[PDB]
Design an enzyme around this catalytic site. Structure first.
Site, PDB file in Angstrom:
ATOM      1  N   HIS A   1       0.848  -1.193   0.000  1.00 50.01           N
ATOM      2  CA  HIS A   1       0.000   0.000   0.000  1.00 50.01           C
ATOM      3  C   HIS A   1       0.884   1.244   0.000  1.00 50.01           C
ATOM      4  O   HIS A   1       0.915   2.006   0.971  1.00 50.01           O
ATOM      5  CB  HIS A   1      -0.965  -0.005   1.192  1.00 50.01           C
ATOM      6  CG  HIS A   1      -2.051   1.036   1.125  1.00 50.01           C
ATOM      7  ND1 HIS A   1      -3.283   0.845   1.695  1.00 50.01           N
ATOM      8  CD2 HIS A   1      -2.070   2.283   0.583  1.00 50.01           C
ATOM      9  CE1 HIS A   1      -4.033   1.934   1.513  1.00 50.01           C
ATOM     10  NE2 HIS A   1      -3.317   2.809   0.832  1.00 50.01           N
TER      11      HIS A   1
ATOM     12  N   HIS B   1       1.883   4.900  -1.507  1.00 52.46           N
ATOM     13  CA  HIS B   1       1.585   6.086  -2.300  1.00 52.46           C
ATOM     14  C   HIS B   1       2.913   6.675  -2.731  1.00 52.46           C
ATOM     15  O   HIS B   1       3.721   7.069  -1.886  1.00 52.46           O
ATOM     16  CB  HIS B   1       0.813   7.120  -1.473  1.00 52.46           C
ATOM     17  CG  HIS B   1      -0.580   6.702  -1.113  1.00 52.46           C
ATOM     18  ND1 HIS B   1      -1.694   7.263  -1.681  1.00 52.46           N
ATOM     19  CD2 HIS B   1      -1.034   5.772  -0.226  1.00 52.46           C
ATOM     20  CE1 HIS B   1      -2.788   6.705  -1.166  1.00 52.46           C
ATOM     21  NE2 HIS B   1      -2.401   5.786  -0.298  1.00 52.46           N
TER      22      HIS B   1
ATOM     23  N   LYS C   1      -6.612   0.392  -8.313  1.00 49.02           N
ATOM     24  CA  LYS C   1      -7.175   0.846  -7.047  1.00 49.02           C
ATOM     25  C   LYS C   1      -8.539   1.454  -7.278  1.00 49.02           C
ATOM     26  O   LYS C   1      -8.687   2.360  -8.076  1.00 49.02           O
ATOM     27  CB  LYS C   1      -6.250   1.921  -6.458  1.00 49.02           C
ATOM     28  CG  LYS C   1      -6.816   2.578  -5.190  1.00 49.02           C
ATOM     29  CD  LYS C   1      -6.834   1.667  -3.969  1.00 49.02           C
ATOM     30  CE  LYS C   1      -7.211   2.421  -2.691  1.00 49.02           C
ATOM     31  NZ  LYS C   1      -6.096   3.281  -2.288  1.00 49.02           N
TER      32      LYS C   1
ATOM     33  N   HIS D   1     -11.067   3.718  -5.307  1.00 47.60           N
ATOM     34  CA  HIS D   1     -10.977   4.604  -4.155  1.00 47.60           C
ATOM     35  C   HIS D   1     -12.195   5.497  -4.093  1.00 47.60           C
ATOM     36  O   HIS D   1     -12.624   6.027  -5.108  1.00 47.60           O
ATOM     37  CB  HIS D   1      -9.736   5.484  -4.268  1.00 47.60           C
ATOM     38  CG  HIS D   1      -9.334   6.124  -2.977  1.00 47.60           C
ATOM     39  ND1 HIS D   1     -10.091   7.099  -2.362  1.00 47.60           N
ATOM     40  CD2 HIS D   1      -8.263   5.917  -2.185  1.00 47.60           C
ATOM     41  CE1 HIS D   1      -9.488   7.475  -1.249  1.00 47.60           C
ATOM     42  NE2 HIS D   1      -8.381   6.770  -1.111  1.00 47.60           N
TER      43      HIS D   1
ATOM     44  N   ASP E   1     -12.470   8.440  -3.253  1.00 49.19           N
ATOM     45  CA  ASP E   1     -12.198   9.788  -3.730  1.00 49.19           C
ATOM     46  C   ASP E   1     -12.395   9.914  -5.240  1.00 49.19           C
ATOM     47  O   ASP E   1     -12.580  11.015  -5.742  1.00 49.19           O
ATOM     48  CB  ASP E   1     -10.795  10.261  -3.337  1.00 49.19           C
ATOM     49  CG  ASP E   1     -10.631  10.451  -1.831  1.00 49.19           C
ATOM     50  OD1 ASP E   1     -11.538  10.090  -1.054  1.00 49.19           O
ATOM     51  OD2 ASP E   1      -9.564  10.958  -1.423  1.00 49.19           O
TER      52      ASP E   1
ATOM     53  N   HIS F   1     -10.538   0.872  -1.475  1.00 47.75           N
ATOM     54  CA  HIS F   1     -10.882   1.730  -0.346  1.00 47.75           C
ATOM     55  C   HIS F   1     -12.353   2.065  -0.589  1.00 47.75           C
ATOM     56  O   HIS F   1     -12.698   2.733  -1.567  1.00 47.75           O
ATOM     57  CB  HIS F   1      -9.971   2.968  -0.417  1.00 47.75           C
ATOM     58  CG  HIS F   1     -10.330   4.094   0.505  1.00 47.75           C
ATOM     59  ND1 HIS F   1      -9.380   4.795   1.202  1.00 47.75           N
ATOM     60  CD2 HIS F   1     -11.525   4.688   0.779  1.00 47.75           C
ATOM     61  CE1 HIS F   1      -9.969   5.765   1.901  1.00 47.75           C
ATOM     62  NE2 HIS F   1     -11.264   5.714   1.650  1.00 47.75           N
TER      63      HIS F   1
ATOM     64  N   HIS G   1      -6.652  -1.217   4.363  1.00 53.65           N
ATOM     65  CA  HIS G   1      -7.016  -0.719   5.707  1.00 53.65           C
ATOM     66  C   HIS G   1      -8.371  -1.189   6.237  1.00 53.65           C
ATOM     67  O   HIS G   1      -9.241  -0.387   6.601  1.00 53.65           O
ATOM     68  CB  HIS G   1      -6.857   0.816   5.825  1.00 53.65           C
ATOM     69  CG  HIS G   1      -7.371   1.582   4.642  1.00 53.65           C
ATOM     70  ND1 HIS G   1      -8.696   1.592   4.265  1.00 53.65           N
ATOM     71  CD2 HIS G   1      -6.726   2.390   3.763  1.00 53.65           C
ATOM     72  CE1 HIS G   1      -8.846   2.353   3.192  1.00 53.65           C
ATOM     73  NE2 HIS G   1      -7.663   2.854   2.874  1.00 53.65           N
TER      74      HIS G   1
ATOM     75  N   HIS H   1      -8.961  15.939   5.947  1.00 56.39           N
ATOM     76  CA  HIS H   1     -10.248  16.230   5.311  1.00 56.39           C
ATOM     77  C   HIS H   1     -10.706  17.668   5.496  1.00 56.39           C
ATOM     78  O   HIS H   1     -11.830  18.009   5.120  1.00 56.39           O
ATOM     79  CB  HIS H   1     -11.322  15.266   5.819  1.00 56.39           C
ATOM     80  CG  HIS H   1     -11.160  13.870   5.307  1.00 56.39           C
ATOM     81  ND1 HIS H   1     -12.157  13.209   4.626  1.00 56.39           N
ATOM     82  CD2 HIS H   1     -10.106  13.021   5.351  1.00 56.39           C
ATOM     83  CE1 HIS H   1     -11.732  12.005   4.286  1.00 56.39           C
ATOM     84  NE2 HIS H   1     -10.488  11.868   4.710  1.00 56.39           N
TER      85      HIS H   1
ATOM     86  N   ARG I   1     -15.740   7.532  11.859  1.00 57.57           N
ATOM     87  CA  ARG I   1     -14.643   6.877  11.152  1.00 57.57           C
ATOM     88  C   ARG I   1     -13.477   6.425  12.044  1.00 57.57           C
ATOM     89  O   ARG I   1     -12.837   5.406  11.769  1.00 57.57           O
ATOM     90  CB  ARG I   1     -14.119   7.765  10.017  1.00 57.57           C
ATOM     91  CG  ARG I   1     -13.031   7.078   9.211  1.00 57.57           C
ATOM     92  CD  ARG I   1     -12.781   7.726   7.885  1.00 57.57           C
ATOM     93  NE  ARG I   1     -11.381   7.572   7.527  1.00 57.57           N
ATOM     94  CZ  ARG I   1     -10.837   8.040   6.416  1.00 57.57           C
ATOM     95  NH1 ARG I   1     -11.586   8.665   5.516  1.00 57.57           N
ATOM     96  NH2 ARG I   1      -9.545   7.872   6.198  1.00 57.57           N
TER      97      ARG I   1
ATOM     98  N   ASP J   1       0.507   2.616   3.754  1.00 57.24           N
ATOM     99  CA  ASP J   1      -0.248   3.837   3.400  1.00 57.24           C
ATOM    100  C   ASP J   1       0.682   5.050   3.427  1.00 57.24           C
ATOM    101  O   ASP J   1       0.308   6.111   3.921  1.00 57.24           O
ATOM    102  CB  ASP J   1      -1.475   4.067   4.314  1.00 57.24           C
ATOM    103  CG  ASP J   1      -2.704   4.518   3.554  1.00 57.24           C
ATOM    104  OD1 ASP J   1      -2.573   4.996   2.401  1.00 57.24           O
ATOM    105  OD2 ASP J   1      -3.824   4.408   4.124  1.00 57.24           O
TER     106      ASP J   1
HETATM  107 NI    NI Z   1      -7.360   4.462   1.586  1.00 59.39          NI
HETATM  108 NI    NI Z   2      -3.861   4.849   0.809  1.00 54.60          NI
END
Ligand code: NI
Ligand code: NI
Ligand code: NA
Ligand code: NA
Ligand code: NA
Ligand code: NA
Ligand code: NI
Ligand code: NI
Lengths: 836, 836
Positions: free
Chosen positions: B403, B405, B486, B488, B490, B515, B541, B589, B605, B629
């Site tokens: 995982h 990024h 992925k 996600h 978002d 995700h 996660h 966020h 969350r 992550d």
């Molecule tokens: Ni995530």
């Molecule tokens: Ni991530």
């Protein structure tokens, strides 16, 4: 924080300053490096406070440290400190000139911002100018043997006019009036690179001398273009009139010639002191090497006084003047190093160095044959020629370290930053085998190491593991790229392996390096010598602290077929050497102080008497090479410094060598520089490519300030391009403000490094084009001519004393006479230079 | 300043020392790292003052810090501190042995040069030996089942002779006298790697044992070359006489055999404690993992006691002895890792590891079949073999973080320095999309990222953006090089995108990582699970703090077609976890504490109950993978440490696992190491290449001191070459003086990194030779076999509990039973090791 690179760098500078401040606060007399850090940091801190101007800080900086707060050498070493900082009106450069100006500094100002207590002046406890030039008290005469004339020159201009030494005088600004006819083919008889200034309305008499060489005028205003002759003179005068260049006949102007005569009115003179300041020293002058006791005397100079190649505003290397206009483009030098003092085993001389296609193309007098005498066609400076200014500096060959353990890449950076441009040894990284031995054992690793190092701007050779009784695997590592093999006791240095390995070498024309059987397990030293069977072999760390038959490996220094090297850490014998080495050995070998056999082994190997003998054997030329043993008993950044520390110690304790004059140390200097330049190259079979400042070889060259000779070079040139150099703050207005660090240059980026360098391999490997197989960009060349070498082939280090070592007392004799030297309590090239 | 690299480095060391000094001055008990910095810096500072010798500083260093000024673990962790400094007589190495030697140090000396006030001893506020080896109080018997003889050996030499354990005894130095006939085919019956010393004139009785394996003598003096037999014995004796090797018949010498018998005079014994010190532990011994509560027991050992492969002076791996002389060159190992404790999901074992062509060639007993039993032809150490010394160390597979990024290159360096050798994830640099999601969206970026990372010595996989309802663009990023996609929230994690993305995966044989929809915008967790339609998917996660259906995403851990991972920052639940995560989420966020809906979202969350459940689910094997992550909610350098901190916490709070013995934690250890080694490789489809210490796989291996296991490795080997390693001062005489840092090695230079590594891509991309299209030097391989996986295929982490989560209270149950664990107030692998 959003820190830019310069902020990160200035923080480091400040940290160095604070270290210097703490030291000052306890009464330490600061060295050069500390003094610079403190002064530069204080200027930044006063700038931060925002209450002082640049002008104020130029003065304040001169009050921080007095003579009593710094070492004796510091006022000599420290001419200026420069730094930039953010003032309320933005970034500004401050130069503090001659900062050590008083007996005692204003220590509250030295410690400003630190919050440290200010020490009383009595806390500071109560000679030799590093790099000093010594010269006779006398004048040199410029430009001898030329036609001369004295002319009155009047400015009719309303703005200032300044004319350089090598400008064609008839071509000057039309608002100067003088006899242009008498000026035809002439130039100012003044020190090369200087000028004569005419303010508006000024009248000055000037002395002019004829240009020489081919006598061809080019450039300027194109008033008088062409060879100097009667036809072109009349054409020039026609142009002078047509174009309104100031001209007035001066019928009674004095005319004559320059010559050796101190009373001739046409002559121009310059004192040797001023000459050396402008151009570096000349024949007969002496230079102190760093802060050592060694004095190098200039043996000869190719300069013709007055025609020195100096580059700069108004100076010599300009179009039509010192820069030739009209020769074939293909013969322009790529780079010229001007006015270099060359120190090399071949001699200590003064010359320009021409570089072309990465090679040393020429050594001698450079410039423009159209106006100078003495310029051969291989030393022409053209439009396409770069200039490196050597005046005041010493140039040497790049050093060659031939006992390198490739334990990490970081030792490579340390090596080149110290002035090393060729590494020979073995390894794969920090594996146990490599930590112990100079061996790259597997063809897989040979390939990977050649690939790994392909973009680094050093020449490399890799050696395989020679410790085998059969030839089969040795052939394989050699064809894979090995240019040599190491026999090491850790892999077995038995007579059977020795013999087999040497037989392989005879076939492959590669050198064998050996670390012998310390334990005397298979035999004593005489039995290893027998196994050599008269064949050429290179004995590593021949004194034996770094390894070898106990206690008498040093006997090999008297064997004709042995090429003997020393490693660095025993160089020279000093107060701490034995205690340091005894513990180093016990750490390396995991020995126990409280086990008698362990201590017996340690004492059998670390011996004051043989280390003392090693000092003497180096001095008389019975040890031929000095090398590192990098991170395996030795120090990669100290090959050069340890060589000079040894020479300095021996001069101090025994005086000049037999073959030395007593006006200088030239013979000793040449003998010692050979130990890390030409002899490693001869021993390993690549001396035609590197190892000396000689025409035809690779331009691997190092520039040194005499005051820092032997410790910290200015610039390292690899294959004719700068690879690493001292550079300051990258954001600064000029290249010199703090922090000044040794940094990688353009020769380290992209694949430039391969273009500048050579990977040395065996003929067997080159025969199968291993560079093509491995996708190497670096040039590859085969080593050769290493199986018929003897001690006699080691330049200036060809001594073969009969060595005996008492097996009980370890007393060493050479030709029946005791070899002893006491331990030294200090060494140069150390405390004056290093921050830690 | 003209700072060399070493000066810059030593300044940093000094700064670390000063930090330690300030801490000491306020009464902080220093950790290992601080203690080393302070002691090393003080040695440098006393050297600067120039009044103390190396010998004096070896003692002074032992007085600086007492037991009361350092943490309890420090006297155990700190055996020595080494540093070099410029003394008045140049650079010298100082080793301070056993520096924590008193209850209270001389704090004025600890603070010398700092200008800090010295604290009273009462300012220092009032267990467990990290990496301890536990063993039974008993002796091992060496070299059993061999012919034996006891011989009197006399030195007639005038210099010392020392003979190693595996030297062929008939081949020793001719100045030893003994019965050479009885010595034929024998060697010393002493601990492997040790020796017997003979001072001049010494007589000692020695016990010899027969060589074994093929029984072939090679090397030495070539006295007795050949297979052991009657013909070659007589030839050997002829040579002994002809060449004057010392020989005297000893007719009544005792002869017999070695065997398991504590009373046999021919036997040699070694206590388990000493055995473990020399060779690392053996079968039944236990090792504490770092400063955790976990104990690993050696399950089996391939060693035959007495024939251990140890490299060094006088040791086993030498020509004709442990290094084979005569086998085909092509079958020599490239490298052998000797005496490794291997910790792997497959078992905790003791073995040598053979490496050839970058692969793990063999695991077992290495050496020379000519003198040792038990050496297969794939474990032969030859002349062309490098040695990495594993004795006393633990070797694991390189970790695989799946995982990642790709936000910056610097996280790659942090990853490998921690022991990670494979990265899987997505990104393009620090763009918003990448800061949020593991996506390399454009084929242009896929090309650029593969090119960008081509010379880095890690394996890489890049994942595209799977969040699309149509297949068209997904096909394109996959053919461009993506090895996964992925989904996600978002970019949209809706049922339509989920279904489309999985359909694409079924076609392309790549893994999908998800995700999920935290907002439950399109559906609740059951609706996402429905959209999977029973197809294989990797849930990132899975606990949900890092993202996913609120509050019950963790339900996926009971779904058969889900492969569930955790990210690191929630591992394990500790005192600060919730406060830290709540604020992290609101920062990420851009949430407002004073807006109720924002706070409602945050609390939905970040949930103590589900994070506590995650500890338990990891422990019982219901979560199969731990990942970072990196810089997007997790920490790239803590994949390994967080895994072990979780295991330690669970052992402390619940005791041994069901399947655990109670003499050790082997089952738990194997379950947890699988989470960052084999399971990420299985999930992503490249387990045939990496992910475990197994024959045939890439030699991506990490070496650990047991005392630092799980925090800071010694050395990271990539494809059989050292890529990164701890190394000290590059100018130092040895590789260990301060500052010791994790540094890049030769596997990071030039294009070596590509030769050592693999870029994992889709079959579609490999089908069009994307490596050729993109000009990659790194090997490329297609991922495969990822569409028929279930939870049952996750090694040692195949649990499928029925998970329920109360939608109001967030209470988690597994198979109807409450999953709770309290928060921990401390974790190991932290305070004992890190400077900040
Ligand atoms: Ni995530
Ligand atoms: Ni991530
Ligand atoms: Na002295
Ligand atoms: Na002796
Ligand atoms: Na709810
Ligand atoms: Na706790
Ligand atoms: Ni050696
Ligand atoms: Ni060495």
């Amino acid at each position: 924080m959003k820190l830019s690179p310069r902020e990160v760098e200035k923080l480091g500078l400040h940290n160095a300053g604070y270290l210097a401040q703490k030291r000052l606060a306890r009464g330490v007399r600061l060295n050069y490096t500390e003094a610079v850090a403190l002064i530069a940091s204080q200027i930044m801190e006063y700038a931060r406070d925002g209450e002082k101007t640049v002008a104020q800080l130029m003065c304040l900086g001169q009050h921080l440290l007095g003579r009593r707060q710094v070492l004796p050498a510091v006022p000599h070493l420290l001419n200026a400190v420069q730094v930039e900082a953010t003032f309320p009106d933005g970034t500004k450069l401050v130069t503090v000139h001659d900062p050590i100006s008083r007996e005692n500094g204003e220590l509250q100002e030295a410690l400003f911002g630190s919050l440290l207590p200010v020490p009383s002046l009595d806390k500071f406890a109560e000679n030799r100018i590093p790099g000093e030039i010594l010269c006779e008290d006398e004048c040199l005469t410029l430009n001898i043997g030329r036609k001369a004339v004295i002319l009155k020159v009047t400015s009719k201009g309303d703005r200032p006019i300044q004319v350089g030494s090598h400008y064609h005088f008839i071509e000057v600004n039309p608002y100067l009036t003088f006899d242009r006819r008498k000026a035809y083919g002439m130039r100012l008889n003044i020190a090369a690179g200087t000028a004569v200034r005419f303010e508006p309305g000024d009248c000055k008499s000037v002395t002019l001398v004829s240009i020489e060489g081919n006598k061809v005028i080019r450039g300027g205003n194109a008033i008088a273009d062409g060879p100097v002759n009667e036809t072109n003179l009349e054409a020039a005068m026609h142009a002078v009139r047509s174009k309104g260049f100031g001209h007035e006949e001066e019928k009674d102007a004095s005319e004559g010639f320059t010559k050796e005569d101190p009373n001739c009115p046409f002559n121009t003179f310059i004192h040797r002191k001023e000459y050396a300041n402008k151009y570096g020293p000349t024949t007969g002058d002496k230079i102190r090497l760093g802060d050592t006791n060694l004095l190098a005397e200039i043996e000869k100079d190719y300069a013709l006084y007055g025609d020195e190649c100096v580059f700069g505003g108004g100076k010599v290397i300009r179009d039509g003047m010192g820069q030739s206009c009209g020769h074939p483009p293909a013969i322009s030098l790529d780079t010229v190093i001007t006015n270099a003092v060359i120190i090399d085993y071949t001699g200590i001389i003064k010359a320009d160095i021409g570089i072309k296609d990465g090679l040393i193309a020429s050594i001698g007098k450079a410039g423009n044959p159209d106006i100078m005498n003495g310029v051969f066609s291989n030393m022409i400076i053209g439009a396409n020629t770069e200039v490196i200014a050597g005046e005041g500096l010493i140039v040497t060959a790049g050093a060659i370290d031939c006992h390198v353990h490739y334990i990490c890449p970081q030792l490579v950076y340390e090596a080149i930053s110290s002035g090393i441009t060729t590494l020979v040894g073995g390894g794969t990284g920090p594996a146990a085998g490599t930590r112990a031995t100079t061996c790259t054992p597997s063809p897989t690793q040979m390939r990977l190491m050649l690939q790994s190092t392909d973009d680094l701007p050093l020449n490399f050779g890799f050696t395989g593991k020679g410790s085998s009784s059969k030839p089969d695997e040795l052939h394989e590592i050699i064809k894979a790229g090995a240019m040599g093999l190491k026999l090491h006791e850790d892999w077995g240095s038995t007579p059977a392996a020795i013999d087999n390995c040497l037989t392989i070498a005879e076939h492959h024309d590669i050198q064998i390096n050996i670390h012998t059987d310390t334990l005397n397990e298979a035999g004593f030293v005489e039995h290893s010598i027998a196994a050599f069977k008269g064949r050429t072999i290179h004995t590593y760390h021949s004194e034996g602290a770094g390894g070898g038959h106990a206690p008498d490996i040093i006997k090999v220094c008297g064997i004709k077929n042995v090429l003997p090297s020393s490693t660095n850490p025993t160089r020279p014998l000093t107060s701490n050497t034995i205690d340091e080495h005894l513990d180093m050995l016990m750490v390396c070998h995991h020995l126990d102080r409280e086990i008698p056999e362990d201590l017996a082994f340690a004492h059998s190997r670390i011996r004051k008497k043989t280390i003392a003998a090693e000092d003497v054997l180096n001095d008389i030329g019975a040890i031929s090479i000095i090398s590192s043993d990098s991170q395996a008993m030795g120090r990669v950044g100290e090959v050069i410094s340890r060589t000079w520390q040894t020479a300095d110690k021996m001069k101090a304790q025994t005086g000049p060598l037999k073959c030395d004059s007593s006006d200088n140390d030239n013979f000793r200097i040449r003998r010692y520089i050979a130990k890390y330049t030409i002899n490693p190259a001869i021993a390993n079979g690549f001396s035609q490519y590197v190892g000396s400042v000689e025409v035809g070889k690779l331009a691997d060259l190092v520039m040194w300030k005499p005051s820092f000779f032997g410790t910290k070079p200015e610039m390292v040139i690899k294959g004719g391009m700068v690879a690493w150099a001292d550079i300051g703050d990258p954001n600064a207005s000029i290249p010199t403000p703090e922090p000044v660090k040794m940094r990688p240059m353009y020769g380290t980026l992209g694949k430039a490094g391969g273009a500048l360098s050579i990977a040395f391999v065996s003929k067997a490997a080159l025969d199968q084009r291993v560079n093509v197989l491995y996708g190497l960009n670096k040039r590859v060349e085969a080593v050769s001519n290493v199986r018929k070498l003897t001690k006699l082939d080691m330049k200036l280090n060809d001594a073969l004393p009969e060595i005996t070592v008492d097996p009980e007392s370890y007393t060493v004799k050479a030709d029946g006479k005791l070899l002893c030297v006491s331990e030294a309590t200090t060494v140069p090239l150390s405390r004056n230079y290093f921050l830690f």
